[PDB]
Amino acid sequence: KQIDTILINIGQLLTMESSGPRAGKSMQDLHVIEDAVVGIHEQKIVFAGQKGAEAGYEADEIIDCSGRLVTPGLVDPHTHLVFGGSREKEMNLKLQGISYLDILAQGGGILSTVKDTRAASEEELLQKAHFHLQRMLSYGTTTAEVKSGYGLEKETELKQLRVAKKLHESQPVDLVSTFMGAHAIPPEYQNDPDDFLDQMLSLLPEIKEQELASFADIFTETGVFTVSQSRRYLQKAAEAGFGLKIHADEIDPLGGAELAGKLKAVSADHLVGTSDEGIKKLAEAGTIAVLLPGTTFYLGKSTYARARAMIDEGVCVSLATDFNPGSSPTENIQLIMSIAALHLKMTAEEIWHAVTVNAAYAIGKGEEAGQLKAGRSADLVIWQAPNYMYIPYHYGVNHVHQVMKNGTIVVNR
Numbered sequence: 382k383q384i385d386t387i388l389i390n391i392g393q394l395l396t397m398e399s400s401g402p403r404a405g406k407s408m409q410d411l412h413v414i415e416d417a418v419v420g421i422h423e424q425k426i427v428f429a430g431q432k433g434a435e436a437g438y439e440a441d442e443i444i445d446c447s448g449r450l451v452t453p454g455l456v457d458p459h460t461h462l463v464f465g466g467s468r469e470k471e472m473n474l475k476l477q478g479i480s481y482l483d484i485l486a487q488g489g490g491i492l493s494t495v496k497d498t499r500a501a502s503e504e505e506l507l508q509k510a511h512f513h514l515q516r517m518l519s520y521g522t523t524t525a526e527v528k529s530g531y532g533l534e535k536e537t538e539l540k541q542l543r544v545a546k547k548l549h550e551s552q553p554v555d556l557v558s559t560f561m562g563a564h565a566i567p568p569e570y571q572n573d574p575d576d577f578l579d580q581m582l583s584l585l586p587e588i589k590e591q592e593l594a595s596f597a598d599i600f601t602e603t604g605v606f607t608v609s610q611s612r613r614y615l616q617k618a619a620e621a622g623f624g625l626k627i628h629a630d631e632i633d634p635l636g637g638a639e640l641a642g643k644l645k646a647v648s649a650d651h652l653v654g655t656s657d658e659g660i661k662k663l664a665e666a667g668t669i670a671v672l673l674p675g676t677t678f679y680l681g682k683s684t685y686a687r688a689r690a691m692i693d694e695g696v697c698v699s700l701a702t703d704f705n706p707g708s709s710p711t712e713n714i715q716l717i718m719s720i721a722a723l724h725l726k727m728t729a730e731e732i733w734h735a736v737t738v739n740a741a742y743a744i745g746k747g748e749e750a751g752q753l754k755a756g757r758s759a760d761l762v763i764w765q766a767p768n769y770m771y772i773p774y775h776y777g778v779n780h781v782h783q784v785m786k787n788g789t790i791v792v793n794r
């Protein structure tokens with residue numbers, strides 16, 4: 382069989398081959414192959430296993446991995462990629478001890494980014510986002526989820542969504558778009574938040590017709606949107622055919638997790654303050670818990686989401702950068718992996734499954750990304766490390782040697 386490409390001399394290969402999301406104990410069952418090969422033809426994986434799996438094939442292009450570690454391209458299931466300006470001028474408020482919510486309550490935070498995003502032209506946001514997405518790619522992310530939510534109005538929310546589609550069609554990273562019009566409350570709506578929510582819901586039909594988003598998200602937090610508003614909002618979104626996601630129980634056990642499970646949301650994200658009942662509902666419903674360790678770290682806190690309890694309870698855990706200018710300005714998914722190990726107390730095996738398979742399922746791409754097996758798009762990363770434990774171990778840097786998307790190297794050294 383004549384094929385396009387073959388990777389040889391792979392020191393360690395992680396296919397992450399699974400039949401579905403990995404919950405509980407299965408997150409620990411990492412299949413490791415040594416001295417492996419990977420065959421690619423017409424942008425797809427034709428084989429990925431131990432040396433000898435290439436018997437019967439002959440490739441034209443041969444890539445020597447020189448004993449390096451090879452894994453599927455990484456999946457970042459939660460980001461706010463498109464945004465205007467930056468929030469460095471808020472560093473001092475945080476340092477002074479002003480809480481994240483108090484900054485928001487005073488017209489800052491998300492609202493500050495909303496003003497800059499509304500003012501930035503669509504072309505500026507595109508170029509701006511292109512730079513950050515290119516960096517994400519250089520760190521190993523070949524598939525990512527991007528949320529709007531910095532417009533809080535028709536014009537800018539649609540603008541963010543169009544930029545996301547544009548990005549998806551003009552660079553390597555495959556993007557999953559999420560509409561998060563219900564991110565915060567414009568000051569002029571503080572007295573009628575339900576009216577604001579209805580105006581955001583009024584956008585679903587055109588967003589749907591334009592295929593501008595596949596999911597709907599919402600910030601269920603004290604002072605922001607309540608559980609009842611979130612239930613009504615999300616149920617409405619589901620009726621329109623949108624998948625469901627939620628920024629839940631970021632500080633306190635508000636019942637955001639319980640709601641997400643009851644609504645059978647694809648994922649519940651953040652969850653630092655979630656209760657045991659919430660954890661049980663997520664596991665029971667199969668709702669993926671996307672943890673954002675960088676956000677906790679960046680907020681200057683030390684109390685992280687209870688990942689071990691979630692895994693002990695059969696929850697499917699994932700990880701993300703939550704890349705956003707306000708609470709987690711980092712594109713480095715590898716650092717997220719390091720923080721998960723050091724502060725979420727997750728093992729290297731669990732972390733790898735979290736940033737590939739589980740991240741993929743968290744955004745409706747379980748059948749398309751996160752695994753290197755026959756038929757899958759040839760998206761992989763060749764690492765500057767001999768083993769998988771080394772990646773989360775050595776922190777704050779970029780271990781990427783080369784990144785392959787659709788069978789072509791898109792990042793070199």
Ligand SMILES: [Zn+2]
Nearest residue numbers: 459461628703
């Ligand atoms: Zn977020």
